[model samples]
Each structure stands twice: as structure tokens, then as C-alpha cells.
Target: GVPFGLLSGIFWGLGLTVSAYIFSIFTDLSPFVVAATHDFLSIFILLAFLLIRNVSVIIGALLAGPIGMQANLYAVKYIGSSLASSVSAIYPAISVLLAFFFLKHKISKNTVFGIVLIIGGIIAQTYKVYIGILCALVCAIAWGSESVLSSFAMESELSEIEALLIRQVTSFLSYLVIVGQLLGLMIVFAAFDMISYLAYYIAINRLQPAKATGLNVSYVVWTVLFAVVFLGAPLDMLTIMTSLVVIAGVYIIIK
Candidate 1:
């Protein structure tokens, strides 16, 4: 579960970092277009493996793919990848609460403490970007609920691939309805999104939703690193310190 969550965070972090670059290069491209193309491409890719018959899985996919990803891309466009990623890492807090209420998952003391550290670190990285922050907050709720739903669905007979296939299909159709039309750069985005989602779903199946989400929030660190190294984005000491705090938070959850 730990490894899968970490892998998912890595791919997701890299994907969002690249997405920020894509937005910079293609100034006219809408977030809906990118979301649609990625989901459409992911469907064909997942079909090659063969695939969900579950309703909860479908809903989960809808939340994670169309709702979550679209809002996330918009957040990235507005705030840049590092800030968007860090701000939205607050999803784990939502997920933990939702899992407790809906899934009846128990939260250990370590889990609560870890979440506090994680959320604190993320909050420390934020600024007063109102529009982007709103979109990111929407993403946090969508992804938070989706994780719980996906975890519940997986507790049944749904396999990780099946859930992922359902997610891509649902998101693609939703995006199709929204954008009506659909890029090479986005194909790379699709690849990264697909791999990260595959790992995330597997991790959700293996661990409680809150724990999985807590681990997945490590994407904040990865996104900052990728932004600095790959995109040559400026990094500050506060960001570096908060990222370590977030990592320490993750370590506590796993321990």
C-alpha cells in the first residue's frame, strides 16, 4: 500500500508539473480539453488490458476523473503547479473525515497527528490566490469523496483495473459532453494520469481510504521538486521546510 501510494504520488506530481508547462505553452487550451483528451486516450489504453461492472466504481471514477481532474487542471492554470498541488493536498483531511463517517474506518492517534502535520505543512505553503484556491478546494472535496467510494467499491468484487477502466470511461464521456471536442502533449499527460491512477486504486484496495489518501498527499513534495527541477520554478526555504514536514507526516502515518 505504501509503495503503491508513493508511486501514484510520483506520477501525479510529475503529471501536474508537466501540465503546468503545457498550459504555459498552449495558452488557448482549456482545462476541459485536456481533461477530455486524457480520459479519452486512457480509455483506449485501458481497453487493451480488458475491464468495471460496479455503480460505486463509476461514481468514484466520475468524481476523481471529470470533477477532480478538471478542477485540478484549472487550479494549476491559475496558481501554478506547486501551489495548486500543495493546496489540494488538503484532500486527505477530507478523505479521512469522510472515511470515518461513511466507511466507519477507525482513525488512530498516529493518523490524526499525521494529518495535522500534513495539513499544517500544506497551509504553510499557500497564498492568497482566491480563484485558484477555490478550484483547488473543489478538487479536494471531489477527490476526497472519490477515494472513499472507490475504497468501498474495491472492498467488494471490483479489481483495481476494473475500477480504473470505469473511471476513465466515465470521465471521458463527461468531458465529451462538456467540451464537445478534444493533443500530443496531453497524451503524455494521459500516460502519467493513467499510471498514477492505477497505483492509487491498488493502494486504495490494500489500505483504508484515509491511510491511502494520507500517503498520496506526498505528491505535494514531488510536485514542488519537479516544478523546481524540471520547470525551473523558483523555490523558497519555507516550501522546502514544509515539504519535509509533509514527508515527516507521511512517515508517521505509515509507522
Candidate 2:
């Protein structure tokens, strides 16, 4: 479960980096369109296994797929993948809070300290990119909420594939209503996104939502590395320093 969470983070980081690059190169593409196309491409996976059983899973799918993905891509476009990922990685902290309130999950002293550290990281990362920060924050909230809901649904006999298929189909249909076009480049994004979703859903099924999400915050580190190497995005001392802070927070939570 831990390894699957980590793998999902790595794939998501790589996917976000690729998304940032695509946005840079294809200046005309709307973030909504990219998200739609990615969801559309992901739907083919359903054909292999023919599969949603819960309303919580349906709503979770809506949040994670359409709302979270679009906001995430917009953040990547506006702030570059490294910064966007760093900020959104705080979703685990949000998930912990939500789980405490809605799922009756207990919060430990370590969790409190971890939340503080993650908040400190977000403060450090915030430097003027207001719109990007807003988008990333939205992504964080949507993903956080989805994690709790999906975890709840999973507790009731819903399989991971069924949840994911519902999510992809819901997102694809929602996007289609907004824009009818699809792109070939989105296949790359969909491939990585699908892999990440599979790993993440499995991890969520095997572990608690907060733990899985905390481990998944490793995506911040991976995104920074990939953004530097692949996209040639500038790496600042602040980002590097905060990445460590965020990972430290994640470790505290998971431990």
C-alpha cells in the first residue's frame, strides 16, 4: 500500500510535468480541454473490465476527475508544475482535517505538527502567483474531499476499478458537454493519469485516506525534479527548502 501510494505520486508528478510542458508548447489549448481529453482517453480502460456502486463514489469521482484535474492543470499552466505540485501537495493536510470531521478519524499530535509544517511549506511557496495559488488550493480541496468520500465508499464494497471507471466516465461526459474536441497529446497525460489513479485507488483501499494522501505528497519532490530536468523550469532555493519541509511533514504523518 505504501509503495503504491509512492508510485502514484511519482507518476502524477511526471504527468504534471508533461502537462506543464504541453501547456507551454501548445499555447492555444484550454486547461478544460486538456482535462476533458485526458478523461476521455482514460475511459477506454473501462472496456477491458466492464464496471460505480455508491453515491459517495460518484461524487468523489466528480470532484477528483473533473474538478480536481481541471484545477490542477490550470495551476500547472499558471505556475509551472513544480510550484503547482508543491502547493497542492498540502492536500494530505486538508484530508486529515476532513477525515477528522466527517469520517471520525482521530488526529494525533504528530498529525497536528505535520499539518503545521505543511502549512509552513505553503506559506513559503506563496510568493505573488495569486491565480496559480488559487487554482492549486482548489485542486487541493477537491482532491482532499474526494479522498475521504472515496475511502468511505470503498469501505462499503466498491472496488477501486469501479470507482475509477465511474470517475473517468463522469469527467469525460462533463467535459464533453463543455467542449466536444479531443487531442492526441492528451493520450500521454491520460496514460500517466490512469496509472496514478490505479495505484492511488489501491493504496486508498488498503490504507486510510489521510495516510495514503500523506505518502502521496512525495509528488512535490518528484515534480520539482522533473520540472527542472524536463521542462527546464527554474529552481529556487525557496522551492527546494519548502519541498524538504513538506516531505518532512508527510513523513511525520505517515510514521
Candidate 3:
């Protein structure tokens, strides 16, 4: 179970890397083309190994990948992924908030403040706070809304092929109907984007796709820590402080 936990974590990290890579590619690719290609390829892959009971489950998730792309498209336009992603990363708090509103659940104020700080960084970056705010909101809604269904999709019985197939196919198909330059942006994402997702396929033992993704979002903090130590990015004072805040926030929220 621990090994699967680690493996699922790895695959999720791979997906994040692919996400960043695709977004970077989106900068150059036709948003529509990239969207179509990736989603198409992704769906095609998903269909190869799908079963019927959970067919709709993966389909629901396939429906999810593009919304993140839309969120990224907007984030890159108004705030760029650097800080935008941080805000987007904190949707777990939004999850708590949603749970409270919709399910009568409650979360701590401290966690809420952290979610605010994350959004603050995003908003502070822009002249139009609304654009950043909107980006944050949309990211939370679009990505967070998909969780429960995605968890169902990521059941432990899933093979790596199942993960890969759904990831690519759903990614491909979701955008099949979307339009614009951003539509071309899909191809940019198609290039060199598999390693992280592959790692995620190996992560969770009993968790479904959605639970794995939530934990994976939690993984972003460790990604920064590991990257700082091994990848040798600046690792400056600001990165250190921000990392602490983000990690603490995630830790508190999960507990």
C-alpha cells in the first residue's frame, strides 16, 4: 500500500509536469490544435482498455482535463502559471469551503487564511484583480468540481494502461468541441508530457483517481522542496518562505 502510495504520487507529479509542459507549449501552439490533439490522443488511449461499469467514471474525468487547460489558458494570459498555479494549487481549501456549503462540513480559519494568501499572491500580480480572482475561482471550480468522480475513476484495480488511456483519451476528447486559438494550443501539450502521469499510475493502491489527484495536488509542495534540493532552482528566501506557508497550509487542511 505504501509503495502504491508512493507510485501514485509519482504518476501525479508526472501529470503536473505534463501540465506545465503543455501550457508552455500552448504559448506557441494553436490553442485549438493542441487541445484537440492531446484530448484526442488521450481519449483514444483511454478507450483502448476501458470497462463499462466505470466507463462513465473515466468519461467524467476525461471531461475534466480540459477545464484545467481552460484555467491554465486564462491563468497564463492574465497571471502566468508561476503564481497562478500556486493559487490554483490551493483548491483543497476551496474543497473544504464547498464541503461546508454543500455538505455542512467545517474547516479551520487558519486554512482559509492560507487559501487567501495563495489567492492574494495571484491577485497582487495583476492590475485587474478580478482577472486573477476570476482565474482562481474558475480554477477551483473547474478542477475541484471533478474530484469525487475522478476518485472513482482511479480505483486500485486500474493498470498503468488504464491510467494512461483515460488520461490521454479524455484529455483529447474533452476539447473536441472547444474552439479558438487556445484550441490549437493542445499540440504543444502533446509533446513530452507522459513521465509524470506514468509516475502517478504507480502511486495509489486503493484510492480512486480523484483521491489520488487530491493527494497529488498536495504533492506540489514536495515537488518544490525536491526541485529546490535536486533541480537546483534558485531556492531563494522567498521560495523558502512560500514553501513553508504552502506546506503548512496543506498539512493543516489534510489533518
Q: Clashes in candidate 2: how many? A: 0
Q: What are the Cα lDDT values of the candidates?
A: 0.77, 0.74, 0.48
Give the TM-score of each candidate: 0.91, 0.88, 0.58
- Tens digits of lDDT, candidate 1, 1-255: 589988988899898887887887766356556666666777765665565447887877777776688878764575675787777888888887788888466778898789889898778667633777887888888888888887776644655456776666777778777762126667777778778988888887877767878889888888888888988876767877888999999999988
How many residue pairs clash in model 1? 0
Candidate 2: C-alpha RMSD after superposition? 2.9
Q: By the lDDT metric, which is better: model 2 or model 3? A: 2
lDDT of 3 by residue, 72-150 (tens): 5544452432445556665654554444455333335654555555445333433322565566556766555554334
Instruction: Please provide, for model 2 over 96-143, each residue's C-alpha lDDT reduced to its tens digit, 9 standing for 90 to 100.
Output: 788889845756788657767877876666762477778788888888
Off by over 4 Å in 1: 48-53, 180-182
lDDT (C-alpha) at residue 83 in model 2: 70
After superposition on all CA atoms, what RMSD does each candidate show versus the true structure? 2.7, 2.9, 6.5
Candidate 3 lands at a TM-score of 0.58
Model 3 regions more than 4 Å off: 1-29, 40-51, 73-75, 94-133, 153-164, 179-193, 198-214, 222-238, 249-255
